[PDB]
Amino acid sequence: NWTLVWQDEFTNGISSDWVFETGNGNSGWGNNELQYYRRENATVENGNLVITAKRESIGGYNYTSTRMKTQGRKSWKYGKVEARIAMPSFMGSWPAFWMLGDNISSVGWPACGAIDIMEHVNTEAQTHGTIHWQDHNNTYANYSGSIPVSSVTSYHIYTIEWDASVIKWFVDGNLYHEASIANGVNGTSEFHNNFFILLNMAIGGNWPGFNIDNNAFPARMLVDYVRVYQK
């Protein structure tokens, strides 16, 4: 069986297992993102985490949102990682539910590896699952898939299953993307390490672009729960 080993149901408030980033990071968190992350953009309403992105100026930036991570408190090697999410859809939006390797502090990005469980940009009628890494030739590599989602603004369940053989991606239980990590094939050795969880909503960047629907603010991403199971 899958055994639950960690969760935030956001029933009281936000678990002390979450840490919050501040500001725009290095060149927009690596992606020329336009937001300044703050703690105040995360609230709880009726058992849901609420990440509000706002048209709000601070530190020379013009948008605020939240970026929260489980880093230095909780991390896992293999398992089922899952969140029930309702996210906004507007030009410039870039919500993400994803994982980074613990060793990012030592080896950096992209050596540490990332598992994107869910990304969405703009008003696309789909969501994406991706892995990012350094292959055995030390080249930056990613492998992505998508599934049609007509209403990202309604709750969906975004899931990975992760073992020594494979990573699989699901939306509402529908398999749509898969990647072998067996024997570190294609240089995937670093996906056999501990990874922590992140939640964020970025505004603009290299992928969503720099056309921002300024009449979409404030914008809410709601997270009913995050859960990790293991064998």
Ligand X SMILES: OC[C@H]1O[C@@H](O[C@H]2[C@H](O)[C@@H](O)[C@H](O[C@H]3[C@H](O)[C@@H](O)[C@H](O[C@@H]4[C@@H](O)[C@@H](O)O[C@H](CO)[C@H]4O)O[C@@H]3CO)O[C@@H]2CO)[C@H](O)[C@@H](O)[C@@H]1O
Q: Which residues are at the interface with Ca ion (CB under 5 A)?
A: 9-10, 47, 224-225
What b/e string do you get for 18-55 counting C-beta neighbours within 10 Å, with b at 16 or more? Answer: beebeebeeebbeeebbbbbbeebbeeeeebbbbbbbe
Question: Which residue type, as a one-letter code, is found at position 14?
Answer: I
Q: Where are the alpha helices (DSSP H) in the chain?
A: 104-107
> After what residue numbers is the chain broken, C–N > 2.5 angstroms?
none
Q: Which of 199, 89, 93, 106 lies closest to 150 in space, CA to CA?
A: 89
Cβ-based neighbours of 101, under 8 Å, separated by 6 or more: 107, 112, 113, 114, 190, 193, 194, 195
Q: Which does 102 bind (CB under 5 to 8 A by kind): Ca ion, ligand X, none?
A: none
Rounded least distance, CB 13 to ligand X, Å: 24
| Rounded distance between C-alpha atoms, residue 221 and residue 228, angstroms | 20
CB closer to Ca ion, 9 vs 178: 9
The single residue among 30, 47, 72, 148 that binds ligand X, judged by CB under 6 A, is: 30
Q: Which of 156, 154, 124 lies closest to 144 in space, CA to CA?
A: 124
Rounded least distance, CB 177 to ligand X, Å: 14
Q: Which does 189 bind (CB under 5 to 8 A by kind): Ca ion, ligand X, none?
A: none
Q: Return the sign of the alpha-carbon dihedral for residues 186, 192, 194, 200.
A: positive
**Is residue 21 near ligand X by the rule CB under 6 A?**
no
Q: Which does 114 bind (CB under 5 to 8 A by kind): ligand X, Ca ion, none?
A: ligand X
CB closer to Ca ion, 83 vs 179: 83
Q: Which does 225 bind (CB under 5 to 8 A by kind): Ca ion, ligand X, none?
A: Ca ion
**Is residue 29 near ligand X by the rule CB under 6 A?**
yes
Q: Which does 18 bind (CB under 5 to 8 A by kind): ligand X, Ca ion, none?
A: none
Q: Which does 59 bind (CB under 5 to 8 A by kind): Ca ion, ligand X, none?
A: none
- Residue in the shown chain whose Cβ atom is closest to ligand X: 30
| Rounded distance between C-alpha atoms, residue 62 and residue 58, angstroms | 7
CB closer to ligand X, 82 vs 119: 119
| Rounded distance between C-alpha atoms, residue 6 and residue 18, angstroms | 12
Interaction residues for ligand X, span 90-129 (CB under 6 A): 96, 98, 108-109, 114, 116, 119
**Is residue 176 near ligand X by the rule CB under 6 A?**
no
Rounded least distance, CB 213 to ligand X, Å: 19
| Residue numbers at the binding site for ligand X (CB under 6 A) | 26-27, 29-31, 96, 98, 108-109, 114, 116, 119, 132
